Amino acid sequence: TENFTTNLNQLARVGGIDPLIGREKELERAIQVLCRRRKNNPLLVGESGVGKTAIAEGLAWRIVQGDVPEVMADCTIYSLDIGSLLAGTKYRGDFEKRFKALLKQLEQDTNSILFIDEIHTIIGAGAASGGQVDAANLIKPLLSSGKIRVIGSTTYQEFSNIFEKDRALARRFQKIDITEPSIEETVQIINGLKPKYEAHHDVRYTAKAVRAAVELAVKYINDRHLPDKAIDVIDEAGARARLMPVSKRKKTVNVADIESVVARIARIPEKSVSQSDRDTLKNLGDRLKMLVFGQDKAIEALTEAIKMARAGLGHEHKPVGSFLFAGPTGVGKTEVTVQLSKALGIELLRFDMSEYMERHTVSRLIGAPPGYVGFDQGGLLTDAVIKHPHAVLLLDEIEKAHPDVFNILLQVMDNGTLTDNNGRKADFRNVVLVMTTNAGVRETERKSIGLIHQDNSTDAMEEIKKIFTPEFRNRLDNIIWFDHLSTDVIHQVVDKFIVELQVQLDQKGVSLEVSQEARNWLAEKGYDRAMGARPMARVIQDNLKKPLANELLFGSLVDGGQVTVALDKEKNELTYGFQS
Amino acid sequence: ENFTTNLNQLARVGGIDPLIGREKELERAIQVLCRRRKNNPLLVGESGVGKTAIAEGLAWRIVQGDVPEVMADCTIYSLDIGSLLAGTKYRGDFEKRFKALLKQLEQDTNSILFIDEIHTIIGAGAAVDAANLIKPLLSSGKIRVIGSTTYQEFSNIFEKDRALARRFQKIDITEPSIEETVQIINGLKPKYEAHHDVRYTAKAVRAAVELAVKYINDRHLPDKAIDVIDEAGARARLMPVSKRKKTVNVADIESVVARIARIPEKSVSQSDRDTLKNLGDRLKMLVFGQDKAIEALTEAIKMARAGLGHEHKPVGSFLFAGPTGVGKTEVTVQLSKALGIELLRFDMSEYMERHTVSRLIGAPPGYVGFDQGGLLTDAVIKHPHAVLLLDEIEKAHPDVFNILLQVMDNGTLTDNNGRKADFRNVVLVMTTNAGVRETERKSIGLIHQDNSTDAMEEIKKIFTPEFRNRLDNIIWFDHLSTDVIHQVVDKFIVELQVQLDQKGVSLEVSQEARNWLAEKGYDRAMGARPMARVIQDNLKKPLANELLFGSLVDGGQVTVALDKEKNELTYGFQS
């Protein structure tokens, strides 16, 4: 009792116990239970970090200040430490000697109250080895008779499983559900606690920063609850301000500082959290358009969806954007995705849907490894979005995917949040969703089997309607078709590849003078209607880089470049100039 | 205070090596130590990474004064678990000592208790303790506690409990980069050199870090680097009695690593040019069969090591096929023996069940700590620089083949455990017996037809077309020749002759017997596998029986021959 119990009332006089802000309903229910003739033992059941221990400690603080009824005045709260009580016993009755002595003290003082945080531990044998003489059994007669008043704090899961098993002890305690009040009430709570934290770090927190902390924490720090998470970011912000600046630097904690702290906790790049991306958004459409030629309606659709979400017009609960890319292979479907990711700077997550074809493999994306194995694994999709809140999810050959996969995406697009089988809540509202399918290209490219060529303009949409359920299509923002690359745009594609090679050669010092006529011949072989531009990679490297590269390493001309290329009608080959 | 040792006072008197690097990790600890709540930091790092030393660095900063004024007057202490557990003999006596020290620390403010190997004191663990007093000091916030715990035993002790995790902040302490590690040695070079007055060349210190991670593969390179350096310096100090070789070279460091590795000095030494140059010669010496395959395979290895400008992909992806036991496995084991690497063996026939596929990349039954994990993935992590042997690849489930494509193309594998493997150095080899099976079957016709088929077409039926393009070169074994099998019989009997030499009895075998044993033992369908059974039961049974009870108890002098009419071996013994 000398060291196991710390008088909270005495402690509050000096300090330590932080003020409790806005828990009248909770305290009123507790004061009512404490006033009961029998079984006047409150229990505080709530999730982690939701102010369970602040109410008990806060009650002592409120008593000292006279904010409680007269019946509760002249009341002392004692905070029993179970670990101290179970340390140093090393004997048959050392635990019972000290524990019973504590009860005698409480019995002597009618108004004394015992606060036992993490009360689930008493059910566990305190000092009982192969015996049932536990702490809980010893206090069961006293709680029933109202001799002592006990306040306990334990989590819902611990309360449901560890507690409530012994219906005897559970009966004495009166469950009081302690839930997080709101995103807005937490701001008021931090205001009350702000002076203590400000004094510790000798800094002042701006009004905008405190509100930003709560709001930024909810978006990214989802593992913990609102009161603790907001305070933790605030605490870390002051500490960084103490160590980072040497001296005579801004003491005030700016809003940008809060974003840096929350970014490291969430391992975010710290660029997405900030709203300084307006400059990139200004010319995002034009910049992306020059990077990939043709299919302009796709880049504008992507930029418009991102631009609206960053302007306050984004969906409240749905993702930033859901899109389906229906077009021939190698028409820039994956190009707009990767180039968008690079310009924005966010990651590009890619998942091959050909792998997830059977029913047994659908669980992988939204389930932990088979059985109950693997540590920080979760669903394959869930850990990627949790790891990167702002990213670009890419799915290729979605049509091949099992029907059960589409059912998973329905809640994603409709609600914007995905819950893994493990139990964690994955919230990915910033990630844009893009799917690439080749369903319609097959029907449009193939001609009708008949003397008359039937109209295939509407045939492509018909396949998508039957292949994709109406519910799935309704959630999608828009369906964009990637059209075959015309000869005009095809010239731009070869220009990009050859210019790219020129840049690489420029550092080496080699120069090229490829003719415009050579571009036309390269385009026909490089681009195929069925395979698109995927074979074009080899044509540029093999026709241009490989002959010259071999000569560069060992050839007639060791170095000096000044190479030229021209089409050869008879040989259909490219000329190579060797000027030292 | 007697149990613990003040690191802050220790720095004043010296004996603490100047920390180099980990500026970000060190700065992180100071930031959390200045927190109003949850100030207690944690150091999640593997053994040898340098988690204990980074805490020592903080004490040096305080003495140096390059920290805020809040921590300038602070002190740090190191809990000695051994001192507390010294002679108590009862659980609870230990706790009393801990409480007394806490009160001594509590009276004086700005005191930090660095608990090294915190995992041992808290939690039940696997291989004692109470853990009752660690919780109140954390909740009281009076004295900050720095706890060093390994990655393993941290998920089963800290993540499982909210109280400890809530009050502790996790600091990921990864191993330093090779460039960073060599810089540390330069920082620590004046202290080691002053002990024995030897000068280390820049090449030797850089080589030690590079070679240590490649060969030891036991603990992290920072601890390994200091060990080989100190060991070489100590060895050099006293290696020559007459000569005081104050200079150091790569020759000395190579021998030191060889001793602990227990691998030949030539293999451990950075003699890749020498080993690759004589790779074929060393391999051809022991095994003289399938010279055509060896010549193609030997050249493929030298060019493979170069990488042709692509290193992310696995260096070795050669596939072997042909009749069973005709040298498919001998070359692989002999290749490893010459190199000195530890050969691994996995039979794909065994892993022909979907449940078995999970065994390779995890455990279907529930395991604690996932120590066993994947049968193959864990072994790769254990010995990355080792060859992987696969048997009966043809008889494998289709899904398994998909995983193989990722290894050669992606260059990395992800499983439930999540451990990454550097497949770049990893080599791969496979043996296919399907080809020989096609020629053994007989066609459904009145007259049989030639069953010889191109090796390329056979692979297409059993293997996906997206694998032969990514492979370097295909090697196929058609069949052995009379001259090769005959010579092999002579080599095998030598083992029996060597065995008999220790026993003290000689043996003599006629040339006719050697030729007769080759045709019967060798089988086209089964290669040379039945030859060992045929030769062993024939020769071993009669000699063993006589050696125990008979004229051959001592002396030997045996003679073997076969009558032409009988066409059966005859055994003659002389007392």
Binding site: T89, Y91, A127, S129 | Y90, R91, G92
Partner: peptide, 11 residues
């Protein structure tokens, strides 16, 4: 955990 203890007087 519960173990009996036998004492001895000084004299």
């Amino acid at each position: 955990e519960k173990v009996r203890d036998a004492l001895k007087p000084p004299s």
